[PDB]
Amino acid sequence: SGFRKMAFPSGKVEGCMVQVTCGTTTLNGLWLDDVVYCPRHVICTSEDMLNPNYEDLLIRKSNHNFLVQAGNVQLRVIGHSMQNCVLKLKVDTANPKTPKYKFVRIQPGQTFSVLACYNGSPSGVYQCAMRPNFTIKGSFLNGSCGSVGFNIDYDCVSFCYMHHMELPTGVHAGTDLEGNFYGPFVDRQTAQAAGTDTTITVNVLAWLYAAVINGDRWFLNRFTTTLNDFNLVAMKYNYEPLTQDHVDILGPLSAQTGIAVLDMCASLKELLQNGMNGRTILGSALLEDEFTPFDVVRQCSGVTFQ
Amino acid sequence: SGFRKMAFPSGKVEGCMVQVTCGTTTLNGLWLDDVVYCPRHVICTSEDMLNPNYEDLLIRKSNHNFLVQAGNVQLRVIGHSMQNCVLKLKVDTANPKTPKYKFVRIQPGQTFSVLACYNGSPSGVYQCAMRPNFTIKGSFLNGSCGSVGFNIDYDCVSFCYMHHMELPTGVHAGTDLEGNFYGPFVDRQTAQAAGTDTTITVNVLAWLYAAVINGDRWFLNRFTTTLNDFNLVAMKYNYEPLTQDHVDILGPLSAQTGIAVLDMCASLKELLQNGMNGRTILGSALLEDEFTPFDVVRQCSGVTFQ
Ligand SMILES: *[C@@](O)(c1nc2ccccc2s1)[C@H](C[C@@H]1CCCNC1=O)NC(=O)[C@@H]1Cc2ccccc2CN1C(=O)[C@@H](NC(=O)C(F)(F)F)C(C)(C)C
Ligand SMILES: *[C@@](O)(c1nc2ccccc2s1)[C@H](C[C@@H]1CCCNC1=O)NC(=O)[C@@H]1Cc2ccccc2CN1C(=O)[C@@H](NC(=O)C(F)(F)F)C(C)(C)C
Ligand code: NA
Ligand code: NA
């Protein structure tokens, strides 16, 4: 029993973190085989953040201008190139701790773990969702750039996020590991703002199923609803539409609890219209939307990773 | 900016997890140097859980009756002994991944990370507090016994918890790594219940400081209070007394924000008496008490570990 915001074990990623220094800027890089990946604005200086000419800044750098340290060992840079908003620094040593890995571009609504790092050293790990507005609600300080997000499946680390920017509402923006930003954001000091966010309905339903699995059932009512009638209510409360694909993805949780998805939707409708009236669900007084159906299954069935 | 329930990087502990099988029971063990630590009820059978005679059960086991596997490699057991509620299995191979480590008995109110494991394989990591009633609000399924809790300081892993039991309210009980239970609990199938819990006041204050650091300030009022008058209110709402030691431990956060502890206490008093009136603090509609002052400092200052 119990339900926690649980992150993936971080050890496979810890062995890949390095620090990259160029001039006065230091941030984190990801060392896989003989390549270090890091945000390209490691080459920027303070006066020139409004609209950096990255190609012009980089042509004045040579391999020796990049100082890469894995723990206390310097890694010699023997080549460099820019791909979208990342630098690829080729180094003279392949990381002996390189896990089996993939680069993935995740979809809004999916979750991942973040290994927050400073000066190439891990600080902590936590779980995040890719929000519908392509931001993440992270915990990042100065120096955290280049920290990565990831999922683990069996033995394979799927890297999905590299940290670049903090936006005005205290939320965060970054790229996939090919250096393409999630969302409309850019690596310049400009006016950029998160679009209006929405609530991830399929995840709220997954979490209500987690609550039932854990014995927290007070919110189940005797009614049902159609998908269309449910979505008219979801729309009013700034929830995203629920699709038939979402209903089918919730099938395993529906089968485990014996509660049809549309019956759970009827219970969620009443929570949206009436509130919780001072009660909690899984210890929260709000509806939680950063657990996917797969997250709930993993945590309520004990999925491990080699 | 941002504030998340952040766990320690788990890699140093991952390398220590093994599975222990005795008869039909399988659980997790902790492999440090040439010793594997695990809960002693790995030697129990289903019919004999009401009141096991552990000494009598163990005298009928030999080294070969314990099957210890580190990944896919069997570790030969060459000695065994019982210490309180744990078994120490001496093995023929010292763990080459043994970190610098300590065993610590933590105090109520302090936090730690849990590496939840099944069949010796890590599943996820999350942060827990030792509750005043000596339970933890974990997320544990069948097979999780022997999973450990820990803190990391610089390079040293301080192990503080090994998982044994689930109590009726869906909360958890376990031991330090010397096998002494936290709280009055025992490893038998009996009537045991968590005592009434209380809220960890110094942690709530730490979290209110985290909120201010992050720009969430609406709850700050213009008043102050004495320590005694504050504690009369805390008592009514089932908060633990705030001590002068607690006030001093909050000193760094008070200095960083410029808000005297007793002034923050005045703001907390008003939140207890009036509620939040529909507002959130750091994204929560409840007051959070599982961040210590040190946790807040770590997360809002970027402490890393080698
Ligand atoms: C990350 O650690 C980096 N810092 C630097 C410093 C100098 C050069 C390159 C880099 S990367 C840091 C992480 C931030 C820091 C604030 C606290 N929380 C975080 O997540 N990124 C950072 O400061 C980026 C880097 C960058 C790159 C190119 C142009 C401008 C900037 C500034 N920047 C921002 O995040 C800024 N936000 C925006 O401009 C906005 F997204 F449009 F809002 C800001 C510094 C937070 C205002
Ligand atoms: C842990 O994984 C173990 N399972 C077994 C099974 C056979 C032998 C030894 C062990 S250790 C398991 C973790 C639990 C399981 C339920 C779901 N969540 C968890 O955290 N521990 C476990 O089942 C313990 C082990 C034990 C040891 C000696 C006597 C009796 C038991 C049963 N037990 C309990 O946790 C039980 N709780 C209590 O008896 C109570 F604490 F008094 F409430 C119960 C099985 C949850 C009812
Ligand atoms: Na219903
Ligand atoms: Na005040």
Structure tokens at B102: 């300590």
**Segment holding B271, helix H or strand E:** helix B261-274
- Cβ proximity of A72 and A53 under 8 Å: no
Rounded distance from Cα A166 to ligand 1 centre (Å): 6
Q: Of the residues A148, A163, A197, which one is the last residue of a structural domain? A: A197
Computed on alpha carbons and rounded to an integer, the radius of gyration of chain B in Å comes to 22
- With respect to residue A147, please indicate whether it lies within any of the assigned structural domains: yes
Query: What's the resolution in A?
Result: 1.6
B279 contact partners, CB below 8 Å, separation of at least 6: B218, B219, B285
Residue of the nearest CA to atom 6 in ligand 2? B25
Identify all chain B residues contacting A167, using CB atoms and an 8 Å cutoff.
Answer: none
Identify all chain B residues contacting A3, using CB atoms and an 8 Å cutoff.
Answer: 139
Domain that holds residue A75: 15-99
Q: Token pair 């080698």 is at which residue?
A: B306
CB atoms within 10 A of CB B195: 12
- Look at residues B101, B129, B9 and name the one whose alpha carbon lies nearest to residue A9: B9
Alpha carbon distance A240, A173 (integer Å): 21
Across the interface, whether the CB atoms of B137 and A166 are under 8 A apart is answered no
Cα–Cα distance list, A9 to B23, B38, B303 (Å)? 29, 21, 19
- Look at residues B19, B25, B94 and name the one whose alpha carbon lies nearest to residue B61: B25
Asked if B105 and B3 sit in the same domain, the reply is yes
- With respect to residue A230, please indicate whether it lies within any of the assigned structural domains: yes
> Looking at the DSSP assignment, which residues form a beta bridge with residue A48?
none
Asked if B32 and B73 sit in the same domain, the reply is yes
Asked if B84 and B149 sit in the same domain, the reply is no
| Residue A271 one-letter amino acid | L
- Cβ proximity of A163 and A97 under 8 Å: no
- Look at residues A192, A194, A193, A178 and name the one whose alpha carbon lies nearest to residue A85: A178
- Look at residues B224, B219, B199 and name the one whose alpha carbon lies nearest to residue B209: B219
CB atoms within 10 A of CB B260: 14
DSSP B64: G
Alpha carbon distance A298, A44 (integer Å): 42
> Looking at the DSSP assignment, which residues form a beta bridge with residue A38?
A87
- Look at residues A41, A29, A52, A51 and name the one whose alpha carbon lies nearest to residue A82: A41
Structure tokens at A104: 């993935």
Q: Token pair 């057991």 is at which residue?
A: B77
- Look at residues B145, B157, B249 and name the one whose alpha carbon lies nearest to residue B201: B249
Structure tokens at A283: 């210890």
Asked if A152 and A294 sit in the same domain, the reply is no
- With respect to residue A271, please indicate whether it lies within any of the assigned structural domains: yes
Alpha carbon distance A75, A29 (integer Å): 12
- Burial of residue A111 (CB within 10 Å: 0-12, 13-18, 19+) is buried
Asked if A147 and A249 sit in the same domain, the reply is no
Q: How many CA atoms lie less than 13 Å away from A16 in the CB half-sphere?
A: 27
Cα–Cα distance list, B58 to A179, B67, B86, B185 (Å)? 58, 15, 12, 21
Asked if A145 and A162 sit in the same domain, the reply is yes
- With respect to residue A306, please indicate whether it lies within any of the assigned structural domains: no
- If one counts the domains in chain B, the total is 3
- Look at residues B173, B176, B252 and name the one whose alpha carbon lies nearest to residue B210: B252
Torsion-angle region of residue A15: left (phi > 0), alpha (psi -120 to 50) or beta? alpha
Across the interface, whether the CB atoms of A123 and B302 are under 8 A apart is answered yes
Q: What is the CATH classification number for the domain harbouring A263?
A: 1.10.1840.10
Q: Give me the torsion for CA of B87, B91, B94, B98, rounded to 10°.
A: -20
Asked if B1 and B147 sit in the same domain, the reply is yes
Technique behind the model = X-ray
Q: Of the residues B154, B176, B197, which one is the last residue of a structural domain? A: B197
Q: For the residues of chain A, what is the DSSP string, one character each?
A: ------BPP-HHHHTTEEEEEETTEEEEEEEETTEEEEEGGGG--GGG-SS--HHHHHHT--GGGEEEEETTEEE-EEEEEEETTEEEEEESS--TTPPSEEE--PPTT-EEEEEEEETTEEEEEEEEE--TTS-B-----TT-TT-EEEEEETTEEEEEEEEEEE-TTS-EEEE-TTSPBSTT--SSSS---PPPP-B-HHHHHHHHHHHHHTT--TT--S----HHHHHHHHHHTTBPPPPHHHHHHTHHHHHHHT--HHHHHHHHHHHHHH--TT--BTTBSS------HHHHHHHHHT----
- Look at residues A296, A39, A261 and name the one whose alpha carbon lies nearest to residue A143: A39
B70 contact partners, CB below 8 Å, separation of at least 6: B18, B31, B95, B120
What is the SS3 assignment for B12? helix
Which is the closest atom of ligand 2 to the Cα of B188? 29
> Looking at the DSSP assignment, which residues form a beta bridge with residue A165?
A173
Mutation target for A interface from B5, B17, B125, B172: give the one with most A CBs within 10 A.
Answer: B125
Structure tokens at B41: 């009820």
- Look at residues A128, A121, A159 and name the one whose alpha carbon lies nearest to residue A17: A121
Cα–Cα distance list, B245 to A245, B55, B61, B248, B266 (Å)? 55, 43, 49, 5, 18
| Residue B122 one-letter amino acid | P
- With respect to residue B24, please indicate whether it lies within any of the assigned structural domains: yes
CA A24 remoteness from chain centre = 28
Alpha carbon distance A287, B193 (integer Å): 29
- Look at residues A276, A298, A277, A300 and name the one whose alpha carbon lies nearest to residue A288: A276
Alpha carbon distance A132, A199 (integer Å): 8
Q: Is A41 a catalytic residue?
A: yes
Structure tokens at A56: 């012009």
- With respect to residue B57, please indicate whether it lies within any of the assigned structural domains: yes
- With respect to residue A130, please indicate whether it lies within any of the assigned structural domains: yes
B187 within ligand 2 shell (Cβ under 6 A): yes
**Segment holding B196, helix H or strand E:** none
Long-range contacts of B241-246 (CB under 8 A, 24+ apart): B241/B201, B242/B201, B242/B202, B242/B205, B246/B201, B246/B202, B246/B205
Cα–Cα distance list, B106 to A72, B110, B124, B176, B182 (Å)? 32, 7, 22, 8, 9
Asked if B5 and B115 sit in the same domain, the reply is yes
What sign does the CA torsion over A39, A40, A46, A52 have? negative
Asked if B62 and B162 sit in the same domain, the reply is no
Residue of the nearest CA to atom 11 in ligand 1? A145
- Cβ proximity of A94 and A33 under 8 Å: yes
Identify all chain A residues contacting B138, using CB atoms and an 8 Å cutoff.
Answer: 2, 4
B272 within ligand 2 shell (Cβ under 6 A): no
Structure tokens at B99: 């970190």
Structure tokens at B124: 């996820």
Alpha carbon distance B158, B135 (integer Å): 19
Q: Of the residues A69, A99, A129, which one is the last residue of a structural domain? A: A99
Asked if B81 and B115 sit in the same domain, the reply is no
Q: How many CA atoms lie less than 13 Å away from A126 in the CB half-sphere?
A: 19
Across the interface, whether the CB atoms of A283 and B166 are under 8 A apart is answered no
Alpha carbon distance A195, A173 (integer Å): 12
Structure tokens at B189: 């199938």
Q: What is the CATH classification number for the domain harbouring A90?
A: 2.40.10.10
CB atoms within 10 A of CB A191: 5
Cα–Cα distance list, A280 to A266, A269, A305, B68, B254 (Å)? 18, 16, 32, 42, 31
Q: Token pair 């820019």 is at which residue?
A: A82
Long-range contacts of A141-145 (CB under 8 A, 24+ apart): A141/B300, A141/B301, A141/B302, A142/B302, A143/A26, A143/A27, A143/A118, A143/A119, A143/B302, A144/A27, A144/A28, A144/A116, A144/A117, A144/A118, A144/B302, A145/A27, A145/A28, A145/A39, A145/A41
Q: Is B164 a catalytic residue?
A: no
> Looking at the DSSP assignment, which residues form a beta bridge with residue B115?
B125, B148
- Cβ proximity of A130 and A182 under 8 Å: yes
Asked if A10 and A131 sit in the same domain, the reply is yes
Closest chain B CA to residue A14: B11
DSSP B46: G
Proximal ligand: closest to the CA of A87: 1
Asked if A187 and A285 sit in the same domain, the reply is no
- Cβ proximity of B271 and B223 under 8 Å: no
- With respect to residue B306, please indicate whether it lies within any of the assigned structural domains: no
Q: Where are the beta strands (DSSP E) in chain B?
A: 17-22, 25-32, 35-39, 66-70, 73-75, 77-83, 86-91, 101-103, 111-118, 121-129, 148-153, 156-166, 172-175
CB atoms within 10 A of CB B189: 15
Alpha carbon distance A41, B256 (integer Å): 30
**Segment holding B195, helix H or strand E:** none
Alpha carbon distance B271, A33 (integer Å): 53
